[PDB]
Design a protein around this ligand. Sequence first.
Ligand SMILES: [Ca+2]
Ligand SMILES: [Ca+2]
Ligand SMILES: [Mg+2]
Ligand SMILES: [Mg+2]
Lengths: 286, 289
Amino acid sequence: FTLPNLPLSSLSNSRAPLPISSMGISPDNVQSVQFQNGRCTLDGRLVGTTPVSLSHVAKIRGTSNGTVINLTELDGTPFHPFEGPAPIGFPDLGGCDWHINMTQFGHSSQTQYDVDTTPDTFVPHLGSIQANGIGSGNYVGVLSWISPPSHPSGSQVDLWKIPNYGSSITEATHLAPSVYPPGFGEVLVFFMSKMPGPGAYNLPCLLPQEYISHLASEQAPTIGEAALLHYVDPDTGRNLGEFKAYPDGFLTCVPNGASSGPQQLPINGVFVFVSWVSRFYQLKPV
Amino acid sequence: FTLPNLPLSSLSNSRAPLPISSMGISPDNVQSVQFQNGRCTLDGRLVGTTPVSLSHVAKIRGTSNGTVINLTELDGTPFHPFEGPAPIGFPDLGGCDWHINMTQFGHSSQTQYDVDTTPDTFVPHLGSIQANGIGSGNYVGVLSWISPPSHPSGSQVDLWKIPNYGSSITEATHLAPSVYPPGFGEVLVFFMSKMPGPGAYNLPCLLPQEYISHLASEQAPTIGEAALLHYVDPDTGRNLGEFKAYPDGFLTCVPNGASSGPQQLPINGVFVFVSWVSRFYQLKPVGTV
Ligand SMILES: [Ca+2]
Ligand SMILES: [Ca+2]
Ligand SMILES: [Mg+2]
Ligand SMILES: [Mg+2]
């Protein structure tokens, strides 16, 4: 079994096309997460709206009639509700307004599309989102920058969230399931990127995008209960700490206190597969 | 030795963050190319301005003073002329004007930056390009759409070119070397994408970006003279054509006449390494035997 032999700081977020700038843990008011992009199992099964390639990540495609944008897949193929919560690659950033840069094949210019994901017109699961002033035509859009949610008024930017893909929060949209910390002092490890916009925004994901294409390619036939990893300095070969990767596609570690965890590690290290271990294998704290 | 076990249509161009839509050959007024992005050897050596990750591709970072933009690497690290023709990831699309979407950490809004790459103020090799109206501040920019070049006036978009990175076409900028068709009836194979803007623009590259991260990770210790590959349909397992990958990081095939080449192949196939062969190994024309 292998992970990419590439330093983390050379890789991309899997929730937006942004370089990885650090590792992190979630705030204390965040336990589980339910990201729809950046989801890939260790045997290579893509989950949620996750694409193989960053060229599809945090993008939309569709035709505006001036009132709504009717969505398709990025290549123009129809999207149907049975397929998922939104087309492949659709942004999954809850807890913010989006600003998507819209361009066209065969026309000049770009246009900023401002997206509040809270109203009942925002129903990408049914292939329809409000045009919010975007004129008639076919567009490809990519997330450019974010800002605080328009509703509820005065809400914080909270990128641990996903948007409401359905007409209401009660509508089933075929979300990929939530990921939970597995217990025994282990915390989920997130790969962070700086996101432009009027604040110090940091976007977490479960796996760098290049890990997803690697795992989707490798299609490992021999996944065990947990992969014991070392986070290694490439030059010195020094083991900077023990981590576990779980079959559902996430990493954990045991921090060495609130002041010393994966966020204190250099970001130019490489994760290296050591061996398959028990689900309950007890890690040495970072 | 391995290449990604992923269909081409799931992958990205390495000169802009765009899905791969086809394979193609060069125009008959292009024999060699000298792309600076999308360059990686089979043993994993990145060449030119090529980054590992698509998150750096066709991007700029720098500080405008209202007159010029002083460039750095995307992470803010200094860039110096000895390092290359431009910072890592900098766009390499010749034969067009660029329209780059500029955003800022800690600020609202985006701004379109319009770039004619022809004037003597466009000197990314020396870390400086004209601001062309972009206000003071630090920005990250990503290529968004392109249009015909402002100079020479009336010329067509030609993405087979690279821009002039120096103050003059005679200035040495440490460009990655040209790639030439190798002989034996073989043609260079390009991976194509559609680029937004006011025309039917076709962006070629030598390798999908995911192949570059794959090769850079793999760091193959045993590269031969050429890799013999099959282009395979995953479901049926059918061999749709023999190709060669050369150490410098490019693929070739032998077209089955003017009528039948890479452009006629479906784009949902997978390249699979077969064996190391001699540089002079003669391929069967695509689709034949
Ligand atoms: Ca698995
Ligand atoms: Ca110039
Ligand atoms: Mg790694
Ligand atoms: Mg392939």
